[PDB]
């Protein structure tokens, strides 16, 4: 028979693509008026009733390890933090000689030498006058020059003090696609991050993603619906990190019990430096606590899921971190504005062979000079928070690394890992992909154009 | 017994539907290509990026419309042509294509001949314009 080309405009066809998504937030942040970086510089109001269309018959290939959404989110968060820090105070004058003594006023043995009482000369609002002041500095934030100390950052760069009016608390962020692009979502319960998905949908915006910055433990994230999920770009390659998603959260209570006082020191015209004035009461180690039974059950489930890839009879070892700097060797996070680094050796100290409120306690240290994003030369100073700090969070996942193993295959040991925040974003964006619409189609019909 | 969906399919709702049935919801995709799914940026990296994306979207939409006009199919969602179908591109009969295939499958099948078809459409439209001018100059 006679067939002719026919053109269709607006056909449902798409290809894998990369683009620039935009971000949306709920009105609640606008009602806080605490100047959240995301709601202030990047995001717009969220749609009251987001649209989700379920694509019947559609099976789509996903790969969470080659998703540009993660890269865009990493770049966006870094840029927003830098932008929020631009108008803040630069602590150049703070790079001076410090005369430091111990703080032995009712301290515990574990907190001996952790805090230092440092006196120094500082500039005033008058360029021709100097003021002798004192402050308390954490042992990690100072280094001995030769009783003489200097700030750790003084030989690398000057730190920018965080503006107390700016809030970095994670508020949910939705990523939304512009014209000509779509976001596809995999709703399979046992989707491992790579391969086909048979239950696909298209969404205007992603679900509320909280950009939580943490290491060795994913906090306040999404949970698996059926069972614990193990995800890795290549499980057999020990050099690739493993992302573990829990089906039930694990409560973690972190606290700084020391009652701290914030003191303002005028270092220039309109320039104030917020230091630690004094400690009211005794000095105790900040610490985190998790239930022993819940952690043991979660580790058992994780081991059960790992044995599907590493053998039903292989011995599984959970050991602490190998080495590196404080950020990677410790569970690092932000509690009420203070930067905690906690020792997780008590969490990964187990053996499994394939055969009640003890409340595991993790000691923690606190830092004020912060190097984020694994960068160098852009240090940030965190002003102290007045009072006693307590936060409660949910461990929803882990980042793990496997040792080489020597190919013996008899045993496998896993250690907490992290550092690169891109894995944290992948833990939430694994189910999303971006596609570009191709609206033009050509097909045969019996329709023929007039002459 | 007939069960009825609450609302029309929506954006990409016919991606898994047959090519014949998907023709009833081309307008939604066409609209999305320009306006997205149915305030002011600030100077900065983020705002500049968004403005670049919007300009790119406008350019892409205009490129598609330019192609349609060049084929003589401007202002139409379904446009018939004078270009005969070559069985080399595909030998499937009409029933298979329009009742047992999706547009994604069809694109996978005939993705190799798309540019050839586009060029043929261009030539046919140009010849149509020339012949129109000559035939109607004879008037």
């Amino acid at each position, epitope marked *: 028979e006679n067939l002719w080309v026919t053109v269709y405009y607006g056909v449902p066809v798409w290809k894998d693509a990369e683009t620039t998504l935009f971000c949306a937030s709920d009105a609640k942040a606008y009602e806080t008026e605490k100047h959240n970086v995301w709601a202030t510089h990047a995001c717009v109001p969220t749609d009251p009733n987001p649209q989700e269309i379920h694509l019947e018959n559609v099976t789509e290939e996903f790969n969470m390890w080659k998703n540009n959404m993660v890269e865009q989110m990493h770049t966006d968060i870094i840029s927003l933090w830098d932008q929020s820090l631009k108008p803040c105070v630069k602590l150049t004058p703070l790079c001076v000689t410090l005369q430091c003594t111990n703080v032995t006023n009712n301290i515990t043995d574990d907190m001996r030498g952790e805090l230092k009482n440092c006196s120094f000369n500082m500039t005033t609002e008058l360029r021709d006058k100097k003021q002798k002041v004192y402050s308390l500095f954490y042992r990690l934030d100072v280094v001995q020059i030769n009783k003489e100390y200097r700030l750790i950052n003084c030989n690398t760069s000057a730190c920018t003090q965080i503006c107390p009016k700016v809030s970095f608390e994670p508020i949910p962020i939705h990523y939304c696609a512009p014209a000509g692009f779509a976001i596809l979502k995999c709703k399979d319960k046992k989707f491992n991050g790579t391969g086909p998905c048979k239950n696909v949908s298209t969404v205007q915006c992603t679900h509320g993603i909280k950009p939580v910055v943490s290491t060795q433990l994913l906090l306040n994230g999404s949970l698996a619906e059926e069972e614990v999920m193990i995800r890795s770009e290549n499980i057999t390659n020990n050099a690739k990190n493993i992302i573990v998603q829990f089906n039930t959260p694990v409560q973690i209570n972190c606290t700084r019990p020391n009652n701290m006082t914030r003191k303002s020191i005028r270092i220039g015209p309109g320039q104030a430096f917020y230091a630690l004035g004094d400690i009211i009461g005794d000095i105790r180690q900040p610490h985190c606590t998790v239930s022993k039974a819940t952690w043991n059950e979660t580790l058992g489930k994780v081991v059960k899921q790992l044995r599907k890839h590493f053998g039903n009879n292989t011995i599984i070892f959970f050991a602490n971190s190998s080495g590196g700097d404080l950020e990677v060797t410790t569970h690092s996070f932000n509690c009420g504005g203070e930067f905690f680094y906690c020792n997780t050796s008590g969490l990964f100290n187990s053996t499994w062979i394939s055969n009640s409120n003890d409340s595991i306690t993790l000691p923690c240290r606190i830092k004020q000079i912060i190097n984020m994003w694994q960068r160098v030369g852009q240090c940030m100073y965190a002003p102290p928070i007045q009072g006693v700090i307590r936060c409660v969070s949910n461990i929803t996942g882990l980042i793990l690394t496997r040792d080489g193993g020597s190919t013996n295959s008899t045993t496998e040991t896993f250690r907490p890992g992290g550092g690169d925040m891109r894995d944290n974003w992948r833990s939430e964006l694994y189910k999303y992909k971006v596609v570009k619409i191709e609206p033009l189609g050509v097909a045969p019909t019996r329709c023929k154009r007039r002459v | 017994a007939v069960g*009825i969906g609450e609302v029309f399919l929506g954006f990409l709702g016919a991606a898994g539907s047959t090519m014949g049935a998907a023709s009833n919801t081309l307008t939604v995709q066409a609209r999305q290509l320009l306006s997205g799914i149915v305030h002011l940026l600030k100077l900065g990296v983020w705002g500049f990026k968004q403005l670049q994306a919007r300009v790119l979207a406008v350019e892409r939409y205009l490129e598609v419309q330019q192609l349609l006009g060049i084929w003589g199919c401007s202002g139409k969602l379904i446009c018939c042509t004078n270009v005969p179908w070559n069985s080399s591109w595909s030998n499937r009969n009409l029933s298979e294509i329009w009742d047992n295939m999706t547009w994604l499958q069809w694109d996978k099948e005939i993705g190799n001949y798309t540019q050839i078809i586009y060029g043929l459409l261009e030539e046919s439209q140009f010849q149509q314009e020339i012949n129109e001018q000559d035939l109607l100059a004879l008037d």
Partner: antibody
Amino acid sequence: QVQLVESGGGVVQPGGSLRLSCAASGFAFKDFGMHWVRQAPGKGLEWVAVIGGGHGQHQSYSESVKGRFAITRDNEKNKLYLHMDRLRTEDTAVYYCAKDRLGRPWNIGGRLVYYYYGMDVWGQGTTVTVSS
Amino acid sequence: AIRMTQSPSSLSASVGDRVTITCQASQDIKKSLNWYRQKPGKAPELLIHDASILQTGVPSAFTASGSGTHFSFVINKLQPEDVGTYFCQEYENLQFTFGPGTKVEIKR
């Protein structure tokens, strides 16, 4: 062959809740709609609820059970779930799950429509009992 | 909305005689009928769909004829493995109303 096995039926007090699960095999679960049918003891058959195929975007419930029953599928699990909530003395009966001859979602005029043509294959039976 | 009635309530018939069951609908359905058999203490089976077509997997021992509002189920020779509750169902609307059921037994 096309086999349906039903489970999850026990005893629950009035005003409580119960869940019934049907496992399907021998056919494409996603390609057919499914019905929940109730046989009261010594009485005739009474249709309860139906869910469309695929993603199950369509659900129809009997007026007797409307507002307190919910039907659900799991195509990966090949499971059909009925969420009996706010049970009453008359709900006690034998509940069957049956495969419809059709019910696959269809695109007709840009709309999602389901054509149900009855029940071709039934399960074997699962009894629920309410007491107090 | 659509009321479905089976007559007679029960039937006692000899081995090898015509058995007829009448089905009445309040509103016309005119093609949407299913004939089910539930043997004593067993799951129901589907015999005829659309009121005229026998279901695959069953011998041609049953017939159905009807339209509009009136339908009829006809049984071939009443073999011993034939007793069962015969149900007359409609699928014209989303209610899938069932019939009261008809009890068929052999002479005894």
